[model samples]
Target: GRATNGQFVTKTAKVLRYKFVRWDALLIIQFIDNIGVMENPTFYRNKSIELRSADFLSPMLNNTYIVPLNGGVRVESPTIPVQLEVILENNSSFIQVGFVRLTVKNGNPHMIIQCNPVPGNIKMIKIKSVMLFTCLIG
Candidate 1:
């Protein structure tokens, strides 16, 4: 309804419910804080996100992105003990998590860590994983 001699003035505000955007088969992990055994670990404000896919079980390095927390993402776990580090390019991946190993090559954007082909049954197992390392380019 309108007021006596004027029109109805409506005001509105926006709400942020879930910050991280939801994807069908993808995960977004960002380096919040670290508390593990690593020499001279460099912290990163950057975030690693999993992208759209059919199989969530198979993690792909190509569909990943580096962005800030507020950037397009899923519900980021609050400041946790991330094993991630900023180091020279190395083709090392954690033996625990063997879905799609993440690595960086010399002057290259991405590389896959060399590991034995994971058997079908092995992929189903819960693996304790970490030994994170990252390289940055502006």
Candidate 2:
């Protein structure tokens, strides 16, 4: 944010730019080249296309990580968008997915969940279905 000029930082008047980060929810970065609040300098998009859940209702972690039980989990937010992920693990109890215990940081107050980055290509099987229609002449 800038002053009455309605600009970013003052010195950057020559060339000011903004870079935002999506890590841990969206965070904005303001800097010049590599200074100021530097954020990830890349652009990407998450598709918001419409699709049927029944068409692609998939059981994730398709492999058996559990020796005895088929473990699966659903991760979600009480208040957030519809995009979420549920993982299935091959385990004995297979219930370990929901067994995750949340621990606050420094005993103060903060959301707890380890975040890791692993890039991979996701493949979902294509499915199609037909709907029956009732005809009535108008």
- The top-ranked prediction according to lDDT is 1
Q: What digit string (tens of lDDT, one per residue) describes model 1 on residues 1-138?
A: 121121111111111112122234433332222222434466533323222112122443342222211212222222223222221124233333233333323322221222234322221111223323222222
Q: For candidate 1, what is the lDDT?
A: 0.25
Q: What are the Cα lDDT values of the candidates?
A: 0.25, 0.21
As a TM-score, model 1 comes out at 0.21
Runs in model 2 lying further than 4 Å from the true structure: 2-78, 91-109, 112-138
Q: In model 2, which range of ten residues has the least summed lDDT? A: 65-74
Give the per-residue lDDT of model 2 (tens digit) for 66-88.
11111111112121112223222
On TM-score, the leading prediction is 1
Instruction: Tell me the deviation in Å of residue 105 in model 1.
Output: 16
| Cα lDDT, model 1, residue 134 | 27
Angstrom error of the Cα, residue 11, model 2: value is 39
